Amino acid sequence: MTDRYSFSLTTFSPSGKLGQIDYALTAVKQGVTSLGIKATNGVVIATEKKSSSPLAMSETLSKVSLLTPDIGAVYSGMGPDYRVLVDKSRKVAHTSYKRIYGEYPPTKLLVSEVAKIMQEATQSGGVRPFGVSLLIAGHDEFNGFSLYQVDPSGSYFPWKATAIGKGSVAAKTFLEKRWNDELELEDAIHIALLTLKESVEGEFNGDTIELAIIGDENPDLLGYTGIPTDKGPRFRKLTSQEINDRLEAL
Amino acid sequence: TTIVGVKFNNGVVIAADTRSTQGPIVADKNCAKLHRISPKIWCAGAGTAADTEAVTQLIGSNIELHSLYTSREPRVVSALQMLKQHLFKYQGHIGAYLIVAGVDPTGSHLFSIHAHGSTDVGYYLSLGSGSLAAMAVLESHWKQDLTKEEAIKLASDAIQAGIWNDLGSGSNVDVCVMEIGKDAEYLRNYLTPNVREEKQKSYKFPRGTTAVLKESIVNICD
Amino acid sequence: AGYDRHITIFSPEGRLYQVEYAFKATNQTNINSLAVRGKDCTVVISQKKVPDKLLDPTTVSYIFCISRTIGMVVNGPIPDARNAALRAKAEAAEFRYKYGYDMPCDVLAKRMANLSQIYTQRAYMRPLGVILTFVSVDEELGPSIYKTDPAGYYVGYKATATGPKQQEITTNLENHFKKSKIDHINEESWEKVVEFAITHMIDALGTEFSKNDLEVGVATKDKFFTLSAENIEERLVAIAEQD
Amino acid sequence: TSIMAVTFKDGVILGADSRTTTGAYIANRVTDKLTRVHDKIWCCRSGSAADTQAIADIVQYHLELYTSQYGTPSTETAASVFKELCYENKDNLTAGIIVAGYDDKNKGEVYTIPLGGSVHKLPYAIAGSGSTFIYGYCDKNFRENMSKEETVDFIKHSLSQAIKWDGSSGGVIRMVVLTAAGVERLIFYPDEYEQL
Amino acid sequence: MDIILGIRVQDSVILASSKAVTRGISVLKDSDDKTRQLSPHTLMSFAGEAGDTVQFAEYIQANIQLYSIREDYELSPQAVSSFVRQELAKSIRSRRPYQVNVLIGGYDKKKNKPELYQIDYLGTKVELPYGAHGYSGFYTFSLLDHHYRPDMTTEEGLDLLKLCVQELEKRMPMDFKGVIVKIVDKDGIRQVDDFQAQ
Amino acid sequence: GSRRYDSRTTIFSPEGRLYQVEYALESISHAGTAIGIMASDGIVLAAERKVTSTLLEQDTSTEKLYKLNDKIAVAVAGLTADAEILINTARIHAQNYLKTYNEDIPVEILVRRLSDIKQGYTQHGGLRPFGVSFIYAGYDDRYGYQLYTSNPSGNYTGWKAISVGANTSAAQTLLQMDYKDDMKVDDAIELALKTLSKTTDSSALTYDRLEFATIRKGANDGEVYQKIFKPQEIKDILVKTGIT
Amino acid sequence: SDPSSINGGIVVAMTGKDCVAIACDLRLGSQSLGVSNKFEKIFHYGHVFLGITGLATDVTTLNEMFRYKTNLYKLKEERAIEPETFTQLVSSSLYERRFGPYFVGPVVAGINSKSGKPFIAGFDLIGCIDEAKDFIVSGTASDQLFGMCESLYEPNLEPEDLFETISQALLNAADRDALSGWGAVVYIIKKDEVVKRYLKMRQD
Amino acid sequence: GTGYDLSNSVFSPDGRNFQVEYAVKAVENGTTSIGIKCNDGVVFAVEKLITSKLLVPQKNVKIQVVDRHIGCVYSGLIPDGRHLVNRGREEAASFKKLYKTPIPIPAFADRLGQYVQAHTLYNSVRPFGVSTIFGGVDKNGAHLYMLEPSGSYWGYKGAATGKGRQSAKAELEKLVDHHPEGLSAREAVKQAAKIIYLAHEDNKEKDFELEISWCSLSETNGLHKFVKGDLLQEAIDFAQKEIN
Amino acid sequence: FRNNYDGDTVTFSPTGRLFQVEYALEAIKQGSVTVGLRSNTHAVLVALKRNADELSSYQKKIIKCDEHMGLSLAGLAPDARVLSNYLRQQCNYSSLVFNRKLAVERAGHLLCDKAQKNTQSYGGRPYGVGLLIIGYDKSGAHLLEFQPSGNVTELYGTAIGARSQGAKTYLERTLDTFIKIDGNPDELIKAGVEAISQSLRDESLTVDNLSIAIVGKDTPFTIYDGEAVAKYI
C-alpha cells in the first residue's frame, strides 16, 4: 500500500521545457473544438457533442457545465479530467468563497481557484497534469461579463473571443474577422454557430451541438419568489429546439 | 420563538413570528426565522439564532453541491438526514430546533428536528416558546385535506396565538408556501398586526444642542 | 525516456498507454454482453463459459447485485471485477445512509468513473482492467444503462454491448433501432425483453445458446435479480417456438 | 414509552404506543416507535429518541451492506449489530432496544437489549417506562405458540394497561406483524383499547 | 500582587517596581529586579503568577534579541508592544495561560518621543502617560491625575513617583520592601540606585 | 517500487550546480522581459507581454505586474501560475507581519521570506522548483526605495536597475550605459521604455504589449503611492517619450 | 466573571437620509477602575465602519483580524469591500469560533458605494446578524440605548439632525451606565465625506 | 519497448500483469496439493517432500485451520501461504465479532480474494507466491475454493495445484464422471490419498509424507479435523494397493 | 536473466525466484558452521566460533531466549540479535500474559511470519542469518531450522554454515543412535562435537574456539565456552 510517489512527475528538461505540460497541451490539440465569444450584454460558449456510439444518449453527457448561477465552463481535451475539475470547481466556489462572504465568487477569482488546482498537478508528488483547456464564461456585479481560458499549466488569460482544440487556428482566424466591441448577444450566438460549422463534418444540428450563454437573470429559473434581491441565474444552456431555430436563420 | 408547519392537499406551509430577544429585552422586532435550504425546501428555526441560520446554510450549501453532482432536484429527506446527522454529532450543543418542509420529485414533506438530532413526521407541527399556544390552535382547527388557503390561515392563526399569548414571541407573521406544481412563495411579513402608534411628541433636536470638543474629516480614500 | 509506458503519465503524443492497455485486459475473458431497455425494465445478457469440468458452475458469474435496485455486469478479469463490485456496493450503501434515498444508477456510474479517473492521474494506482455496465429502473429516469471504462469515461445508453465481438452486437442493435424509430424495446413483460436480447445476440454472434451458455440479469421497479438456469431455459424454449 | 415483541406459532408481532414527551408536554402523539432495519427484521425503540434513531439508522446501513455481500442476515445477526453499537458506546447512549425478526428457517425470534448493552433471546419481551406496570399481567397471560389474533389480543390488552398507568405512554397502539406472508401494519385507536 | 508603576515624562519613561518576593508566610527576598531589558531603548516590567512571570519576560527578551540580530535593527516600542500583546492574547485561550501583567517603557529613536504601554494578561494594551497593574493604581492614580504634566522633566517625574510610593507605604497593607526605579531615554536604560533615601 | 521514476530534482551535478535551478533559469530566459529602475524619488517597473492577439482582452488583464502590499509590487518573468502561488503566500506574509507588529513589512524581510521558500524546493522534498524570477519594487521607512531580484535558486540581490527574462544581457548593457544615480522617476520611465524598445523581438513596441507601474511619493501628500498604468496611460507615456 | 462586563463600553448606529452615523464611548475600565479615556471602539476598512464592544483584548484582536482579511480582499478582488459583504465576513468569522467565541458585540455601518443605500447591522458573539432598518445598539448600556433610541429615533433624518439624535442617545445612555463614558465620538457618514466629532460629557 | 515485467502493477501491451504470471511459476514449482468436495463436506491433502531422514515425521504440518470450520492448504512459497492464512484468521474473527455467526465459506473466499488482488494493485508490494485451496461447511452446504496469485478464485468440484497438477486434475475429472450423484467423506479421504500418490510420480526422486484433513457435517460435526492414526493408515494402504 | 530482477525483494524473476532472498541465503553459507541435535530428553547446540586475528576475540554464536529455549546463528550476526531479541519478547509475553512457557513449535511460526514480512514489501531487506533453535517444552525436546526465506523446519538434528554438509550426513547416518541418548547430557554433546568435526577442514576445534549449549528435562538452557568445553575436545 501507500503512495510512495512523493516526488514531481513534471520536471524541467535541459532546454527549459516542462515535458508533461507540453504533452498535455497536445492532448488538448486532439480534442474536439470548443469556443467562447463575449458580447456587450452576454457571453456564449459552445462545442460539438461528438458521440462515441449512436447507441449512446448524448444528452446524458454534458460538456457545458454550470459552475455557479452566473458562471459556466466548457473544455477541449480529456473528458474525464474535465468532469472531476467541474466537481472540484463547484465545491471550491462554496468552501473558498460562498461559505465565507455569503455570495458566489466573481469570475476571475473562481478561474483563479481552478488555475491553482491545475497548477498543483504540475508540481505535487505523484500526479500528472490535467489534459484539458477550459473556457470559463461568467458574470459578476462589479466586473460585468468575462471570458477566460485556463491551460494545463494553470495559466489563464482573459479573451474577447477564442477557440481551443482541433480546429482552433482556423476558428481564431474566423473569429478575428467577425468580432467587434458592439455585438449584441444574439449576434455572438450567430457567430458561434457559424464558427463551429467549419469544425463539424457530420450532422450539424441542435442535438449535436452543445451551447450555453451568460446573459440576463432568468427569474423563471430561480425556483422561489419573495426575495426582491435574488433575480435568478445568468447561466442558461440552450435547448435543442432553440439552437435549431437559429440555424434556419443561418 | 413561535414556528409552525401545516400540510395541505397539494403541498406544505410554514410560518414564524419575527421577535428576537436577549433575556427580557427585544433585540430585533423583525427578524427572519424562515430559512431557505434550497429553492423548494425551506426551514423554520427555533433555539439559537446563529445555530439555526448556520446549520441551514451549511446543509444548504452541501445540498446545492449534491444536486449539481447528481443532476437531480434536492429532496427534503436528504436535508433532513444531513441536518440530523450533523446535529447528533454535536450532542445538542448546536441549539437548532427546526421545522423542515418542501416539495421534491417524490412529493410534499413536513418534519421536525430537535437539537440532539431526533426527527418527527407530521401533518401539523410547532416548536418554540410559543409551541403550546400554537399547538392549541392547531389541535383545534386542523382537519385532513385542507386547501392551500385554509392551511395558510390555520398556520397564520397558530403564529398569532403565539404572538399574543407568549412573551417569547411577537411583531409579525412570515409565511412560506411550497406547492407541488409551483415555485415556492416566501411571504415575508404576511401579517403586520403590531404597528406602533404614533408617538405623542417629536424628539427632533434643535441643531447645536450637543457640546462638541473637536471635529475632523476622516479619510476614506487612498 | 521510455517509462511513460509503465505509469500513468503523458506520452509525447498526449496518450496514456497504461489506460489503453487496461482496455485490452477487458477482453481477456472472451465473454460478450449486452444491455437493453424495456418499457419499464432493463436487461443485461452475458455469455457464460465454463471450460473446466472441475469448476462449480454456480460460482462462475460476472453479474453483480449492487443494491436492491442497481445491478452491474463486468467485462474483464474476475479479480478486478470483484474489487469493483465490493466498492460499488459500499458506495451504494453509504449514499443511502448519508442522503436518505437510494443511489441512482447514473450517480453510481459517475462515482465509479471518478474513482477510475483518479487511477488515470495518480501514479501509484493502476487502472482496473474492466468495463462496468450498470442497470436499473431509476425512480426519476426510468430504465437506465450507464457504462464506465478504464479511462474514467461514462455515458447513458439506449442499449449497449461490450466484449471481443462488441461491434457485431452493436451494429445489430443499431439496425434494430433505425427500423423501430424509438429508444427502447416496446414490450410490457420483461420476459419478452429478455427474449429479444437473447435473440439479437444469436443473430449478431451467429451462435445457438443452451441454458448454461448464458447469464441474465433483470432490473424492475424496486428490484434487480438474476435468472436461474431454469428461468433461462424457459426463455430459450419460447424463442425456439417462433422459428 | 411502552413497547413489546411477542413470538407466536406463525412468526412475530411488534407493538408500541405513540407518545413522546418532553416533561409533561406531549411533543408527539402519533410517533412510530416500530422501526424497520430489514424487510423482515424490525425493532422497538425506547430511551433517547436521538440515540435510538441514530443507532437504527446505522443498523439499517450495516444490514443493507451485509445483504449486498452475503444475502439476507439472520435476526441473531441484526441483534448482534445493535448490541455492538449499544455495548461499545454504553457511556454515551441511552437505548433500550427490542429486536424482532422473521426468518424462514428460524420462524419468529425476539432479542432484548437493555441499557447496559447485553443481549437476551426471549419468547417475548417488554420494555419502556410503561412496561413495569405490566410485568405481572404479561407473565400470567403469555403462552407459547398463540395464533395471530390471540397474539394481537395479548399485545393490545398489555399495552392498553401500560398506557392506562404510564403518563409517558399513550396515543395509538401500533403493531407490525412479521410472518412468511409478508409484513402487516396494525393500528388501534384509544376509543377501542381504553374500554378493554 | 507586586507593585508595577510607570510614568512617561517629556523625555523619558520611568518604571518603578517593588523589590519583595513573598512565598506564603515569609519574604524570601527584598532586592528583586522585576524587569528585563528587551532592546537598548526598551524596558519591560512584570507582575503576576509565580513562575510564569520571569518565564514570560525572558521568552519575550529572547525573541526581541533574535529580531535585532536578524535585522541588525531595533524595533520601535510600538512594534515591540504589539508583539507582546499578540503573545498574551494567544496565551489567554491556550491550555495553561501566562498570568502576567506588564508595562513596556520605550524611547522611540525615530520619533524622539518616550512611550509607555500597559498590557495585562488578557492582552489588553493601552498607551498611557502613567499606568500600573493590580492595586497600585487605586492608591496612586489620584495623585498622578492631579500633579501630572506632559512637559515634566525626569527630575520632576521621580519626585511625583516618590509621592506615589509614600502613599503606597502608608495605606497598602503589604510591606513591599521599596522599589527599584529605572529610566529609559534617548541614551538608553539606567537604574536610579539612590531611591531608598532620595 | 517507485524509486525507478524519481528524477531527483534536488541533487548536485559533478560540477556542483543544481540541474533543476539551471534548467528553470533556462525557461525564464525565454519569458517576456521585465525591467526595474530605481530613482531618488521613485521606482519604475516595466514588462513586455510576450506574443499577443487582436482578440486578447487587455482591459481586464494583468499577467506580469502584481501588487503585494500597499508599498510593495513585483514584476514576473516565468510561469505565471507558479508566480501566483508565490505571490499569494507573499501577500499573506505581509499581513501576518502587519498583524503582529502594527507596522508594514520592511521590503527586505518579505523578499527574504519568498527567497527562502524557493530555496527549500532546492534542498528537500523532491519537487520541481518554481519557474519564476521576480523583480521587487517597494518602499519602507528604513532604506526608502528598494529594488530586488530573486530566481529559482532562492538567491536575492539589490539593484539600482535590473532586468529578468529574455535578452537580459543586451538590456543590462543598455541600462549600465545610460543610468545615473541622480535620476528622477520621469527619466527612469523613459530609460525603461527605451531599453525594452531596443531589446524586443517584435517589430515595434505598442501599448498593448506592455505593462507599466510606478511607486512615487505623491507630490501633494508626504506619503507613498503605487500606480499600475491603465492601458490608456501606457498609450500616453509611449507618445511623450516619442515612440508614438 | 462576565467577560462582557469587565472593560465596559457602548456602540450605536443609526440610518438617515442618504447617510449613516455610528457612535461610541471612549472608556476602557478594569472593573470599577477606569483605565483609559481614549479607547476608541469604531474602526474602518475603506468605507465600511465597524464598531466593537465587550472584552477589549478581543476588540483589538478582531480589528486586527478584519484589517488583515479586508486587505487581502482588496488585493484579490481589486475593489474595496462593501458593507453587505463585510457583514457576512464578520458573521462567518465569529461562528468559526462557535465553542470558544470572542466576547464582543460588533456593529457594522456604511454606505454601499454602488447603490448608495445606507446600511447598518448588529451581531451577537457567535455571529447572528440583525439587519435593522433604523438603529443598532451594543455594549454594557444597551438596555439604556434601546430605551433612548426607541424614543429619540425617526426615519430619514438629515446628517446634521441624525448627529444630534445619535449623540443624545449615546450621551444619556452612558450617563446611566457605570462602566460607560469618559468621552464619546460620533461619525457621520455620507457617500463621499465622513466627519468625526468628539463630544463633551461628564467625566465620572 | 520492454521492461513491462519489472514492476508489479504494470499492464503489458497485451494487457497482462507479468509479475503475477511469474508468481504463478513459483506456485507450479511447489509441492502438489488437492481438495475434494464430498456430499456433506470437503477433504484436503498435500504432498510433503522428505528432504532427509532428519525431518521429524508427522511434525511439520502444512494444512491450516481458519476459525473452527475452515481448512486451507497451499503450494508454493510457504511463508506466503502462512501470511495469507493469518489474514484469513483476522478476517474471520472480525466477521464473527460483528455478526455473531461464523463466516460463510463464499464470504470467506472473497475476503481472501480481495486481499490477494490488493497485492497486484501497487508496485510497492509483490504478488502472492501461492495458490490456496480452502473450504468448509456452513449454514447451507459444503464449499471448495481455489485462489490464484492474481486474486482469481472459483468454487470447485475438486481442485489441485503444484508440480503434480495435471495428474491430479485428470484423476479428479474421472471421479466427477464416475460419481455424478456425489462421493462420501470416508470415500473422498481414500481417493485423496490415491491422487497424491499418483501425483507423486512427477517428483519421484525424493520420498514423501502424506497429510489429509477433512470437514464433514456427519463425520466431524462441521468442524475441521486432521486425519490421524487408523483412518490415515487405511487411506495410505488404499493408495499403496492402487499404485500397483 | 538474473541481472534485472535482483534489485529488491518486491520483484519476482521470470522463473518465479526471489533473488534478494537467495542472496541473503548465501550470507548463511559463508557463515561459520554450527550443528544442533536432540534426543527425547535433551537438545544440543554446538557451534564453531570464528575470530578476525589472533589478536581478536571469537565471536559468539549462541543466544539464550528463555529458560527453556535458545538458538545458534550463521550469517549476519546483527540480524540474529534482532530476531533473538524478538523471540525473547515473545517468550516473555507468553509468560506475563498466559503464565505459559512458549512452545518451540510456535516460536518457529512467529519467526517464520516475522521473516516473511521482509520479503513482500518495498524498501526492506530479508534477514541474512540462519538460526537453529532448541528448546524443552510441554511436548519434550525440539530442534528447529530457520531460513531467512521464512521456512522453519522441525528436525532431529541439522547443520548450517560453511561445509555444513559434512555434519549433516554424519547426523543422517547416526540418526538411530543419538535419538536414543536419553538421560545422558555428556553423551549427546559428544555426538554433537563429533558431527561438527565432520565440517572442519581448516583446523582443529580448540578451547576458546568451540561453543556448546544444552537444554532439557531438568536442565535450563545453558551455554558452555572456555575451559568449560575442555572436557569435550
Curated annotation (Swiss-Prot), chain B:
Keywords on record: Cytoplasm, Hydrolase, Nucleus, Protease, Proteasome, Threonine protease, Zymogen
Give one Pfam hit by family name: Proteasome
Matching InterPro entries, A to Z?
Ntn_hydrolases_N, Pept_T1A_subB, Proteasome_bsu_C, Proteasome_bsu_CS, Proteasome_sua/b, Proteasome_suB-type
Active-site residues, as the UniProt record annotates them: 1 (nucleophile)
GO CC annotations, alphabetized: cytosol; nucleus; proteasome complex; proteasome core complex, beta-subunit complex; proteasome storage granule
What compartments host this protein? Cytoplasm; Nucleus
- What are the EC numbers? 3.4.25.1
Swiss-Prot/TrEMBL GO biological process terms: proteasomal ubiquitin-independent protein catabolic process; proteasome-mediated ubiquitin-dependent protein catabolic process
**Superkingdom, taxonomy of origin:** Eukaryota
User: Could you tell me one molecular function GO term of this UniProt entry?
Assistant: threonine-type endopeptidase activity
What is the reaction catalyzed? Answer: Cleavage of peptide bonds with very broad specificity
The function of this protein is: The proteasome degrades poly-ubiquitinated proteins in the cytoplasm and in the nucleus. It is essential for the regulated turnover of proteins and for the removal of misfolded proteins. The proteasome is a multicatalytic proteinase complex that is characterized by its ability to cleave peptides with Arg, Phe, Tyr, Leu, and Glu adjacent to the leaving group at neutral or slightly basic pH. It has an ATP-dependent proteolytic activity.
Question: Other comments?
Answer: The side chain of Thr-1 acts as a nucleophile, and the N-terminal amino group acts as a proton acceptor.
In terms of PANTHER family, this protein maps to: METALLOPROTEASE TLDD, PROTEASOME SUBUNIT BETA TYPE-7
Q: Which family does it belong to?
A: Belongs to the peptidase T1B family.
Tell me the protein's name: Proteasome subunit beta type-2
From Swiss-Prot, chain E:
- Keywords of this entry: Acetylation, Cytoplasm, Nucleus, Phosphoprotein, Proteasome
Identify the domain of life: Eukaryota
The UniProt entry's GO biological process terms, in alphabetical order, are: proteasomal ubiquitin-independent protein catabolic process; proteasome-mediated ubiquitin-dependent protein catabolic process
Subcellular localization(s) per the UniProt record: Cytoplasm; Nucleus
GO MF annotation terms: endopeptidase activator activity
Q: Which InterPro entries match?
A: Ntn_hydrolases_N, Proteasome_beta2, Proteasome_bsu_CS, Proteasome_sua/b, Proteasome_suB-type
Entry protein name: Proteasome subunit beta type-4
Species name: Saccharomyces cerevisiae (strain ATCC 204508 / S288c) (Baker's yeast)
Curated annotation (Swiss-Prot), chain F:
Q: Give the main location.
A: cytoplasm
Q: Where in the cell is it found?
A: Cytoplasm; Nucleus
Mind telling me which SMART domains this protein's record contains?
Proteasome_A_N
Any one Pfam family here would be Proteasome
User: Renumbered to this chain, where is the cross-link Glycyl lysine isopeptide (Lys-Gly) (interchain with G-Cter in ubiquitin)?
Assistant: 99, 198, 230
Kindly list the GO CC terms recorded for this protein. Answer: cytosol; nucleus; proteasome complex; proteasome core complex, alpha-subunit complex; proteasome storage granule
Enumerate the UniProt keywords alphabetically. Cytoplasm, Isopeptide bond, Nucleus, Proteasome, Ubl conjugation
Q: Which InterPro entries match?
A: Ntn_hydrolases_N, Proteasome_alpha, Proteasome_alpha-type, Proteasome_asu_N, Proteasome_bsu_CS, Proteasome_sua/b
Any remaining note in the record? Present with 17100 molecules/cell in log phase SD medium.
NCBIfam families from the UniProt entry: PRK03996.1 (NF003075)
Assigned protein family: Belongs to the peptidase T1A family.
Kindly provide the name given to this protein in its UniProt entry.
Proteasome subunit alpha type-3
What organism is the protein native to? Answer: Saccharomyces cerevisiae (strain ATCC 204508 / S288c) (Baker's yeast)
Source species taxonomy: Eukaryota, Fungi, Dikarya, Ascomycota, Saccharomycotina
Curated annotation (Swiss-Prot), chain H:
Q: Which GO terms describe its cellular component?
A: nucleus; proteasome complex; proteasome core complex, alpha-subunit complex; proteasome storage granule
| Modifications made to the protein after synthesis | The alpha and beta forms are probably products of the same gene with different post-translational modifications.
What is the residue range of the signal peptide feature? none
Enumerate the subcellular locations listed in this protein's record, separating them with semicolons. Cytoplasm; Nucleus
User: Which keywords does this chain's UniProt record carry?
Assistant: Acetylation, Cytoplasm, Nucleus, Proteasome
Q: Which GO terms describe its molecular function?
A: mRNA binding
Family from the record: Belongs to the peptidase T1A family.
Q: What is this protein called?
A: Probable proteasome subunit alpha type-7
Identify the species of origin. Answer: Saccharomyces cerevisiae (strain ATCC 204508 / S288c) (Baker's yeast)
Q: What is the lineage of its organism?
A: Eukaryota, Fungi, Dikarya, Ascomycota, Saccharomycotina
What residues of the intact protein does this structure contain? Answer: 5 to 248 of 288
